Design an enzyme around this catalytic site. Structure first.
Site, PDB file in Angstrom:
ATOM      1  N   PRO B   1     -81.854 -11.872  22.883  1.00 53.60           N
ATOM      2  CA  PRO B   1     -80.466 -12.123  22.452  1.00 53.60           C
ATOM      3  C   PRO B   1     -80.354 -12.019  20.933  1.00 53.60           C
ATOM      4  CG  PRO B   1     -81.262 -13.986  23.733  1.00 53.60           C
ATOM      5  CD  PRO B   1     -82.431 -13.035  23.578  1.00 53.60           C
ATOM      6  N   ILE B   2     -79.132 -11.823  20.438  1.00 53.27           N
ATOM      7  CA  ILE B   2     -78.862 -11.725  19.009  1.00 53.27           C
ATOM      8  C   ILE B   2     -77.704 -12.658  18.691  1.00 53.27           C
ATOM      9  CG2 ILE B   2     -78.030 -10.245  17.140  1.00 53.27           C
ATOM     10  CD1 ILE B   2     -79.357  -7.884  18.653  1.00 53.27           C
TER      11      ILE B   2
END
Lengths: 60, 60, 60, 60, 60, 60
Positions: B1-2
């Site tokens: 994820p970012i």
């Protein structure tokens, strides 16, 4: 198209200039879109503002 | 994820370091994702660049 | 604070609910900020819209 | 580096695949950064969600 | 200028059209910038993708 | 709603203050949303960080 690129601080103005050019060409060529329709935004991150795996990118 | 986190300027380096760590753990634990796959970006806002209800956050 | 999290599509509503909660707590606790001041946005990416090293994340 | 590209919906999967590749190479080559460090996110916009000069891009 | 607006899903096409117009005018007038230089992106959030205080906005 | 506005550096504090106000009103009025629910983030770009058609906006 509109591109926003997040990069760690430290690159020369020149490198950033090149980046903007090459990326714009790549986008225009990739989508067969007029080069003039490509807008690029570069956003620099301070070394203490980018984490990877919970650690400062600077130390990993 | 970012993850990209927008916070008002004013926090210590330490607090930001903690933030990056705790948030990365929370994300990894929440999704059962490898911690190393979590990337965090902190973006600070100048007090005059954040508005709430049309007013500078600084004065509301 | 305002957090935007980019994750690949495929997670259950429940997992996303948990993610929003855990991340909000982590941010609030990390900065000693009121929990109610934390806003979280989850943005899902289609498997064909996320690349790593020039390859679709889906196949790397 | 992390790139987010906003493009109007309508392109084929193939074109988007190419876009991700070409842009990743352009970024890697431009900054002399390992290709594997380049992450790309494509975000499509519905024709009614992109405005130019106050008009829907679709009709200008 | 380039504006990205995150709004919860549920609005009519018409309302979104108006939003794009009014916001573009407000930006152009505010900065004395040509209206044609204003680009607006609307990004809708699913009710389960927006959190406030750790709770789904939908239920708070 | 949450708006992020990218503008080139160079504007006065006053102009940015006005921008935040006018845009907030435009959004609130456009969607019939409480003004207090509108949050605005201004992000300034250095002249060398914004490209149009592969050229620095500064020189085009």
């Amino acid at each position: 198209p509109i591109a926003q690129i997040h990069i760690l601080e430290g690159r020369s103005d020149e490198q950033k200039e090149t980046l903007i050019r090459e990326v714009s060409e790549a986008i225009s060529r990739s989508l067969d879109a007029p080069l003039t329709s490509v807008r690029v935004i570069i956003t620099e991150m301070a070394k203490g503002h980018f984490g990877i795996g919970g650690e400062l990118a600077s130390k990993v």
